[PDB]
Amino acid sequence: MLCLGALTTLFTAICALTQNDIKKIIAFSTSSQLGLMMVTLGMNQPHLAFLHICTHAFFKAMLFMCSGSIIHSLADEQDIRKMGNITKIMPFTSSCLVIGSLALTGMPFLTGFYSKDLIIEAINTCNTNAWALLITLIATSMTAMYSMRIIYFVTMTKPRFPPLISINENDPDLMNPIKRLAFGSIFAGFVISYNIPPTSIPVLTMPWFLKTTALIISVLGFLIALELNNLTMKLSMNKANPYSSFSTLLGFFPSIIHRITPMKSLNLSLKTSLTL
Ligand X SMILES: CCCCCCCCCCCCCCCCCC(=O)OC[C@H](COP(=O)(O)OCCN)OC(=O)CCCCCCCCCCCCCCCCC
Binding site for ligand X (CB under 6 A): 254, 257-258, 261-262, 265
Using CB under 8 A as the binding rule, whether residue 220 contacts other proteins is answered as no
Which CB, 1 or 167, lies closer to ligand X? Answer: 1
CB of 263 to other proteins, least distance (A): 6
Distance CA 109, CA 113 (A): 6
Q: Is 152 in contact with 22 (CB distance < 8 Å)?
A: no
CB of 26 to ligand X, least distance (A): 18
CB of 143 to other proteins, least distance (A): 18
Any idea what DSSP says for residue 197?
P
Which CB, 1 or 175, lies closer to ligand X? Answer: 1
Angle at alpha carbon of residue 226, lines to 11 and 153, rounded to 5°: 80
Q: Is 160 in contact with 242 (CB distance < 8 Å)?
A: no
Q: Is 238 exposed, middle or buried (0-12, 13-18, 19+ CB in 10 A)?
A: exposed
> What b-and-e string marks burial along 36-61, b requiring 16 or more CB atoms within 10 Å of the CB?
bbbbbebbebeebbbbbebbbebbbb
CA distances from 111 to 58, 237, 266 (A): 9, 41, 48
Site for other proteins in 23-42 (CB under 8 A): none
Q: Residue 162 touches which of ligand X, other proteins, none (CB < 5 to 8 A by kind)?
A: other proteins
Contact stretch for other proteins (CB under 8 A) within 31-39, 93-101, 139-147, 218-226 = 93-101
Which CB, 190 or 220, lies closer to other proteins? Answer: 190
Site for other proteins in 134-173 (CB under 8 A): 153, 157-158, 160, 162-171, 173
Q: Is 188 in contact with 55 (CB distance < 8 Å)?
A: yes
Which CB, 18 or 87, lies closer to ligand X? Answer: 18
Q: Which of 1, 27, 156, 187 touches other proteins by CB under 8 A? A: 187
Q: Who's near 263: CB < 8 A, 6+ residues apart? A: none
Site for other proteins in 51-90 (CB under 8 A): 53-54, 57-58, 61, 65, 68, 72, 75-79, 81-82, 88-90
Q: Which of 227, 230, 231, 269 touches other proteins by CB under 8 A? A: 269
CA distances from 108 to 113, 189, 201, 202, 273 (A): 5, 11, 20, 17, 60
Q: Residue 95 touches which of other proteins, ligand X, none (CB < 5 to 8 A by kind)?
A: other proteins
Using CB under 8 A as the binding rule, whether residue 231 contacts other proteins is answered as no
